[PDB]
Structure 1
Amino acid sequence: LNFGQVVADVLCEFLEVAVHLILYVREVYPVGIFQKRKKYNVPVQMSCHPELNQYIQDTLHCVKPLLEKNDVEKVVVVILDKEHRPVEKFVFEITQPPLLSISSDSLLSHVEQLLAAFILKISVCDAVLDHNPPGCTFTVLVHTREAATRNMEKIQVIKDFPWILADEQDVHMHDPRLIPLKTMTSDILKMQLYVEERA
């Protein structure tokens, strides 16, 4: 029984709710494709668009074995303008502790209450961010840890869904404004979520 995979599974489920919500509150897509729902006992917005939904799953399906190996240091939802320049980064900094501790108190009730706080902060972040320009799009950047091997082999999990190395323009953001959202430390997961925004 591999608890590093349990942790990968909680993170991928949560990262899916979180991408969907980010796309909502940053209005990356039209509002009508979203349905209000509850996850982590808290309101969220999930897209009902089939291929957007398939694209987010394929992305996260590819990330998940790196998560199970603790080989991922950040997962970044980056939002691009009509000119392919980053306007916002949503940085999920993730580290499993050196040894996972698994309580029988209620391991998953608790991590879910801690994840719920990340969702709530995402909801109210449009109260402090500048409205995005029209025609913005998104992508997902994965930063791996230094002792990680042939990531571009381990990460290509899905048949016709290649991964590449990003360019400097994909990620360039000279002197951004930093917006912390939430931080958690659990026996299984240390996670930071903050937003970098273009000056």
Structure 2
Amino acid sequence: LNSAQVVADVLSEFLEVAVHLILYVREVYPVGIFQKRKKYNVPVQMSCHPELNQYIQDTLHCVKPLLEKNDVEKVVVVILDKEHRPVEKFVFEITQPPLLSINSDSLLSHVEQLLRAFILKISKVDKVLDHNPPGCTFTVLVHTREAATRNMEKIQVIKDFPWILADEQDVHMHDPRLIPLKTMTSDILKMQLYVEERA
């Protein structure tokens, strides 16, 4: 589909903005590399560190194809402690329609409004979430059907950025305290965002 390209693009920049902001609000990186920026008419924090920015973009460019052929279920930004085990998880459940309309009009400016709300919620999450333990790092998990990864092969080699199966310990969460943030729905995208904290 051609309208899938645009939903994969739009969704991709959103995820990048979200990731940059989640890294900010959860003190995963030194406050100083983050710069004030503005997307969806809202103030955000984008990083100015070369490699970090390239790491996040290389990650999203690999998801882009999975997003097109509606192969993404959950895109998760996981925060780990020195024990190298999950402390927090920002789950973005995703599902697009079986097919996308060829009557490509500006119902997208409607998506921007919906997206805008996720950004704002993420910006306040540090109010309902205690401070994480020092020295945490992040990773990105992506939930798909083992067969749709075929769409990823070519681009992994392109961006020279390989992926691999996740080990159930690398994902495992204790309990955990589910904290819902936002849930949107629409002609092209139904998305939900919630946080998983540990005890």
**TM-score bin, normalised by smaller chain:** over 0.9
CA, structure 1 residues 132+107, in 2 after alignment: closer, same or farther (shift >3 Å)? same
Instruction: For 2:90 and 2:168, locate their aligned partners in 1 and report how far apart those are by CA, in whole Å.
Output: 17
Aligned-partner SS, 1:125 = helix
Instruction: Using the TM superposition, give the Cα deviation of residue 103 of structure 1 relative to its aligned residue in structure 2, in angstroms.
Output: 6.6
Instruction: Using the TM superposition, give the Cα deviation of residue 169 of structure 1 relative to its aligned residue in structure 2, in angstroms.
Output: 1.4
* Matched-pair contact (CA < 8 Å) for 2:178–2:196: yes
Instruction: For 1:32 and 1:168, locate their aligned partners in 2 and report how far apart those are by CA, in whole Å.
Output: 34
Instruction: For 2:149 and 2:161, locate their aligned partners in 1 and report how far apart those are by CA, in whole Å.
Output: 20
Aligned-partner SS, 2:170 = coil
Instruction: Using the TM superposition, give the Cα deviation of residue 99 of structure 1 relative to its aligned residue in structure 2, in angstroms.
Output: 2.8
Aligned-partner SS, 1:156 = helix
CA, structure 1 residues 149+136, in 2 after alignment: closer, same or farther (shift >3 Å)? closer
Q: TM-score, normalised by structure 2?
A: 0.93
Q: TM-score, normalised by structure 1?
A: 0.93
* Matched-pair contact (CA < 8 Å) for 1:184–1:191: yes
CA, structure 1 residues 176+155, in 2 after alignment: closer, same or farther (shift >3 Å)? farther
* Matched-pair contact (CA < 8 Å) for 1:65–1:154: no
Instruction: For 2:170 and 2:6, locate their aligned partners in 1 and report how far apart those are by CA, in whole Å.
Output: 31
Instruction: Using the TM superposition, give the Cα deviation of residue 102 of structure 1 relative to its aligned residue in structure 2, in angstroms.
Output: 6.7
CA, structure 1 residues 97+104, in 2 after alignment: closer, same or farther (shift >3 Å)? closer
Runs (5+) with no aligned partner, structure 1: none
What whole-Å deviation, never above 9, does each CA across 1:43-88 have from its counterpart, x for those lacking one?
1100000110000000001110000010010100000001100000
CA, structure 1 residues 80+88, in 2 after alignment: closer, same or farther (shift >3 Å)? same
CA, structure 1 residues 60+140, in 2 after alignment: closer, same or farther (shift >3 Å)? same
Aligned-partner SS, 1:157 = helix
Query: Over aligned residues, Cα RMSD in angstroms?
Result: 1.8
Aligned-partner SS, 1:16 = helix
What whole-Å deviation, never above 9, does each CA across 1:81-122 have from its counterpart, x for those lacking one?
011000001001110012334777632211001000000000
Instruction: Using the TM superposition, give the Cα deviation of residue 26 of structure 1 relative to its aligned residue in structure 2, in angstroms.
Output: 0.2
Instruction: For 1:91 and 1:123, locate their aligned partners in 2 and report how far apart those are by CA, in whole Å.
Output: 15
Q: Percent identity?
A: 96
Runs (5+) with no aligned partner, structure 2: none
